[PDB]
Amino acid sequence: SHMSICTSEEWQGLMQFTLPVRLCKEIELFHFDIGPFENMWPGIFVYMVHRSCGTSCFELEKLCRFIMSVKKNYRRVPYHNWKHAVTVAHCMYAILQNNHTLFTDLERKGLLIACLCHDLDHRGFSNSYLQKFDHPLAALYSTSTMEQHHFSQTVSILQLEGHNIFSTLSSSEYEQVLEIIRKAIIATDLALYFGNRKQLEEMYQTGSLNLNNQSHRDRVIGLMMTACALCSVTKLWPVTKLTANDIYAEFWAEGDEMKKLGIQPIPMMDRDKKDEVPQGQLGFYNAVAIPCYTTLTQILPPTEPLLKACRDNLSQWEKVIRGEET
Numbered sequence: 001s002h003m004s005i006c007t008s009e010e011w012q013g014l015m016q017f018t019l020p021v022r023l024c025k026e027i028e029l030f031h032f033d034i035g036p037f038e039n040m041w042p043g044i045f046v047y048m049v050h051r052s053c054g055t056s057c058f059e060l061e062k063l064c065r066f067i068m069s070v071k072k073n074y075r076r077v078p079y080h081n082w083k084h085a086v087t088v089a090h091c092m093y094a095i096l097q098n099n100h101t102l103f104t105d106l107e108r109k110g111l112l113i114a115c116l117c118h119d120l121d122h123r124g125f126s127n128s129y130l131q132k133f134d135h136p137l138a139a140l141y142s143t144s145t146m147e148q149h150h151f152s153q154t155v156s157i158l159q160l161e162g163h164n165i166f167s168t169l170s171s172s173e174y175e176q177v178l179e180i181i182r183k184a185i186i187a188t189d190l191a192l193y194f195g196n197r198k199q200l201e202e203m204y205q206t207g208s209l210n211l212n213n214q215s216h217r218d219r220v221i222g223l224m225m226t227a228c229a230l231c232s233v234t235k236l237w238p239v240t241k242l243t244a245n246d247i248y249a250e251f252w253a254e255g256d257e258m259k260k261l262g263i264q265p266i267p268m269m270d271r272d273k274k275d276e277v278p279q280g281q282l283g284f285y286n287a288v289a290i291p292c293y294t295t296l297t298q299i300l301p302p303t304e305p306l307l308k309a310c311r312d313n314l315s316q317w318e319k320v321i322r323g324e325e326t
């Protein structure tokens, strides 16, 4: 399937990697920023998998090959890259650690892997772009185009020799974890978030939400995936601000291509309309981020720190709009 594969030096190096003692405590916190520790990113993921799922959950050799090959199949784009993948996986780790027994062993291992793989082989182009210009991917995947591709990429990596970390699961559990991963990755398509959140909010307010109901579990997991995928808005302001720079760098490049195809891009993707960014961020926080973390906190009380951090960043964008930026 034209997948990149890690080298022996790469996965063997990870196998011997040891995570500094000081970071063990930091990694448990919601606001942890992996940014200053690039060389340790693969190791941080191994650590989280081991703490959440156990050191024997996966054959170590296979897990290290899987991780280093996943890294190699993320592209050098400004935002939807390897750093983003590990950042999202860490948010999931923090959510799971704080709500551990609400999720099964199968779900925790599937969700950590889904987060690491949720944007696999992203090229820096949105579903809007692929569908507007009839990219082959849009023909193959009519909706949630890039997300269906990310899942396909995930399965392709598992299919590489010695990379299938899930093979030791019974045939029933194997099928189940692949479905958990497929649904989780598809849920990262923000187009689906709006309806999912509205539904969950109503089930919560009316008291019909039932975690013993599979469809309800699927929706809760979907909201968790959205929360993790957007977690840059829950970091300390300087981190959130720096990440916004990368997000827009990617958007502006897409907008440049649209102009070449004769189409005016939306203002958010127009590098000649940067003055509109602060209000654009306000709109995103009000329509997507705040409601997401608000409903997540209602369903999973321990995730409240994400909501508090999101609210703090909304306030920061409001300060920018008032001309108080430093």
Ligand SMILES: [Mg+2]
Pocket: 118, 119, 146, 188, 189
């Ligand atoms: Mg995505």
